[PDB]
């Protein structure tokens, strides 16, 4: 017998200490490290209720991460209520890594293992576990990226469907790669581009609006354009090797696509100097990008969708969004929940 | 796919007294009030959570689909519209007003002024003045013929005091028509009233 | 304390463009959505939209799409926000006082509401009313409030020292274009003879002023 608690947690990763690479650094002083064999354990005939909704592991990653960044990457300017402030800049290494969740002595975390599900109510196939897997602190909009998939089939992740107001996450249950590249010889510096196979993202397009056929009356389901807002969202904002990238994804979203749609897709890019802030504490910025060739090649594990409001009846319509990076957190840690042993 | 209805979106009732109005949806529901000419103020929310800063008269019961907004002690502040809320969606509403104050319209009409005929323009009216209830029916006579399309007629809300309200009919029609006929009648029908009220003037 | 003031009234041509703003203060503005909402005359309430302060984020249904842009910017310390909604192309329907809302709970309860924005949408330039008399015959009189543009008037008696069965009725909207109310009030017989009558009507919008006497 025990209850729903919440406690401080630590976390665990493999940093390594001769590593200059940011997020290597912070873990190498903030965690201890992984376990070679971590138990787990599957209760028998026990039904745990969940709710990756209101989850506060959630917070304190959110804490964690804000902290990397203060501390690794600070800008050349920032604002400060009604003043300026000036520091060095200089550049830096970046690529995370994987950081496990771990309870104190007195508590457990709990895991769901039904394949299918949506991350809020009851849940059959229950175990124990010491630590949660390795997550990467990846931070990012409209699009979740080097996270985990579901075990088939697709997934859609609410809190209430019905409030418009409320973010959608979409679970895929097959990666697709994203291919983005600053190109060598920088003749805009700032010009940047990400590369999609078509074939396989219009395929696994498709069968998400299926899903969504599911959750809304056999409805027609439409994809269209961010409405507004920072440009931190209307585009899929995005960090790689500690530069700022932002990506139209008009041609990801395209309904005609789900004649020639099976071609490379190709998003053109770029690398701002100047932005908003995530942790949501206004302006900032940053020295021009570095030389040579800036490549990133990342998996598209999830999609964030905001749903069009208002009577409409015919159809559904579904634009990209983001903004409140703790729903990144909350893609990988839907399934787990910590509870006090009494 | 949220649907939400009404309750019989307009009801009267004495001070002092208890009312009730029904919303049947399927979301968190909430109610508000609201006074002519003003913002909407919020009452309840999520059914039956009581909003702070507000009279313990109001209250509402959360069983099943449908959701009840009652009314105790009914104090002359009270009466204003009424509605409920489901996210996006709200109901046009339901109107308040109170009872037993049955009197009779003071019926007036008034003729065109001369300085209204100069610029080729005769507006009559005819007067309806405080009276219960709001029913009312009235038609233009001009030489004992029924007029009709060429009417506009207007209301005021209920009066704080005397529970009253006021209609005013305006015939408007050329200089021209006007000058072509003599007798131009105002017939009144009120439920109140024995015997509908004719009043008339002769053009001169 | 909160706090939500909306600016002062809009008039405009069809097809044209306007801009209503919403400044709020006295809370922690990033942590609640703002809603705007609309009320046609004698109609319901009608949603606009959502928009996120922290990120700038719209939600608008499928009529205001297209239509409509809900924007945001924050002081120097966070510490108050303007709101604004631009509605774009306007229709002669789209008559309406808009409000803005914030949004408490996920029970999508709104606490605070704005005063509300009178939005005029016609062709129809700036006109005053003319005011004439309605000669009287206890006895009943009053002043006639014929075709102005746009609403509002405000009529008093004696300067606001006869207030006793005034009833000001609600204006109409004439074909024409124009608008046009009446404004009466009731006295005993004896009263015509010795007292002075003086009907007070302002029409700010047109910078008209006038006091007629009303007299059998
Ligand atoms: C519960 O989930 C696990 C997956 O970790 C699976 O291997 C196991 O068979 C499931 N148990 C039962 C009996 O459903
Ligand atoms: C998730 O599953 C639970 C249990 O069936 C259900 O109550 C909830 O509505 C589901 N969420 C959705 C519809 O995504
Ligand atoms: C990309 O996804 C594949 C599985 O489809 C996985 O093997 C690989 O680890 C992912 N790459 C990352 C997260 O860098
Ligand atoms: C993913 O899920 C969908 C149904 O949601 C299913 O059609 C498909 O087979 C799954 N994909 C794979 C690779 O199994
Ligand atoms: C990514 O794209 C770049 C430039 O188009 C190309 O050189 C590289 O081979 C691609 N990488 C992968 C693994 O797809
Ligand atoms: C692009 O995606 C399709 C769909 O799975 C795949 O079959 C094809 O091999 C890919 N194209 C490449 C890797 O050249
Ligand atoms: C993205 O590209 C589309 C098509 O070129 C363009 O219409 C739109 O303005 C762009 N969106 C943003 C946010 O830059
Ligand atoms: C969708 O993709 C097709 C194929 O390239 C393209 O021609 C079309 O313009 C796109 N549809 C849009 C963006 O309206
Ligand atoms: C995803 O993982 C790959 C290495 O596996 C890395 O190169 C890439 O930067 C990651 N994505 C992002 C945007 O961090
Ligand atoms: C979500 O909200 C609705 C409407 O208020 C409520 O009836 C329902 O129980 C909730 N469902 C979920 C998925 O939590
Ligand atoms: C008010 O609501 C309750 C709950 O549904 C309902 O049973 C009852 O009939 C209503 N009360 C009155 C006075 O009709």
């Known amino acids: 017998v025990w209850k729903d608690a919440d406690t401080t947690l630590f976390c665990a990763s493999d940093a390594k200490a001769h590593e200059t690479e940011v997020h290597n650094v912070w873990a190498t002083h903030a965690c201890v490290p992984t376990d070679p064999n971590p138990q787990e354990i599957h209760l028998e005939n026990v039904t745990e209720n969940f709710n990756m909704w209101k989850n506060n592991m959630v917070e304190q990653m959110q804490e964690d991460v804000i902290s990397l960044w203060d501390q690794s990457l600070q800008p050349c300017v920032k604002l400060t209520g009604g003043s300026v402030i000036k520091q060095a800049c200089p550049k830096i290494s970046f690529d995370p890594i994987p950081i496990h969740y771990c309870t104190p002595a007195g508590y457990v975390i709990l895991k769901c293992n039904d394949k299918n599900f949506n991350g809020t109510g009851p849940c059959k196939n229950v175990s124990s576990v010491q630590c949660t897997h390795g997550i990467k602190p990846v931070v990012s909009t409209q699009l979740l990226l080097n996270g985990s998939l579901a075990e088939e089939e697709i997934i859609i992740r609410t809190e209430n469907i019905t409030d418009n107001a409320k973010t959608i996450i979409v679970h895929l249950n097959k990666s697709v790669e994203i291919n983005c590249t600053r190109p060598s010889n920088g003749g805009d510096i700032r010009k940047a581009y990400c590369e999609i196979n078509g074939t396989k993202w219009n395929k696994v397009l498709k069968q998400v609006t299926e899903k969504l056929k599911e959750h809304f009356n056999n409805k027609t389901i439409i994809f269209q354009p961010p409405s507004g807002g920072d440009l931190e969202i209307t585009m899929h904002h995005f960090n790689c090797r500690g530069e700022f990238f932002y990506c139209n994804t008009t041609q990801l979203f395209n309904n005609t696509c789900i004649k020639g749609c099976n071609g490379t897709i190709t998003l053109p890019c770029k690398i701002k100097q100047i932005i908003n802030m995530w942790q949501g504490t206004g302006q900032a910025m940053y020295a021009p990008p570095i030389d040579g060739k800036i490549n990133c090649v990342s998996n598209i594990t999830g999609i964030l969708l905001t749903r069009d409001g208002g009577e409409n009846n015919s159809t559904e319509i579904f634009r990209p969004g983001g903004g409140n990076i703790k729903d990144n957190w909350r893609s990988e840690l839907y399934k787990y929940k910590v509870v006090q042993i009494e | 796919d949220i649907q939400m209805t009404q309750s019989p979106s307009s009801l009267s009732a004495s001070v002092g007294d208890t009312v009730t109005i029904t919303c049947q949806a399927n979301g968190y529901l909430n109610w508000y009030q609201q006074r002519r000419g003003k913002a909407p103020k919020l009452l309840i929310y999520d059914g039956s959570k009581l909003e702070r800063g507000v009279p313990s008269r109001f209250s509402g019961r959360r069983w099943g689909q449908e959701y009840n907004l009652t009314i105790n002690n009914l104090q002359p502040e009270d009466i204003a519209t009424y509605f409920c809320q489901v996210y996006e969606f709200v109901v046009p509403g339901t109107r308040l007003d109170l009872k037993r104050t049955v009197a009779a319209p003071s019926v007036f009409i008034f003729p065109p002024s001369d300085e209204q005929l100069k610029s080729g323009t005769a507006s009559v009216v005819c007067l309806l003045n405080n009276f219960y209830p709001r029913e009312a029916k009235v038609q233009w006579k001009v030489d004992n013929a029924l007029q009709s399309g060429n009417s506009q007629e207007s209301v005021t809300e209920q009066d704080s005091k005397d529970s009253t309200y006021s209609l005013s009919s305006t015939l408007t029609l050329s200089k021209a028509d006007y000058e072509k006929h003599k007798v131009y009648a105002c017939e009144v029908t009120h439920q109140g009233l024995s015997s509908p009220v004719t009043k008339s003037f002769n053009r001169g | 304390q909160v706090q939500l003031l909306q600016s002062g009234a809009a008039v405009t041509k069809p097809g044209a463009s306007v801009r209503v703003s919403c400044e709020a203060s006295?809370?922690?503005?990033?942590?609640?959505?703002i809603h705007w909402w609309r009320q046609a005359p004698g109609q319901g309430l009608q949603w606009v939209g959502w928009?996120?302060?922290?990120?700038?984020?719209?939600?608008?249904?499928?009529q205001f799409q297209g239509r409509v842009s809900l924007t945001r910017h924050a002081s120097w310390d966070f510490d108050t926000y303007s709101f604004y909604m631009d509605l774009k192309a306007l229709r002669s329907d789209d008559t309406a006082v808009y409000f803005c809302?914030?949004?408490?709970?996920?029970?999508?309860?709104?606490?605070?509401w704005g005063s509300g924005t009178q939005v005029t949408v016609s062709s129809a330039s700036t006109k005053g009313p003319s005011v004439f008399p309605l000669a009287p015959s206890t006895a009943a009189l009053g002043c006639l409030v014929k075709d102005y543009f746009p609403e509002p008037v405000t009529v008093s008696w004696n300067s606001g020292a006869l207030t006793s069965g005034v009833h000001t009725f609600p204006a109409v909207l004439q074909s024409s274009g124009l608008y046009s109310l009446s404004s009466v009030v009731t006295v005993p017989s004896s009263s015509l003879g010795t007292q002075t009558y003086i009907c007070n009507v302002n029409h700010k919008p047109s910078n008209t002023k006038v006091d007629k006497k009303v007299e059998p």
């Open positions: 809302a914030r949004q408490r709970s996920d029970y999508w309860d709104f606490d605070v």
């Open positions: 006295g809370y922690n503005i990033r942590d609640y959505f």
């Open positions: 928009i996120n302060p922290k990120t700038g984020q719209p939600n608008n249904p499928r």
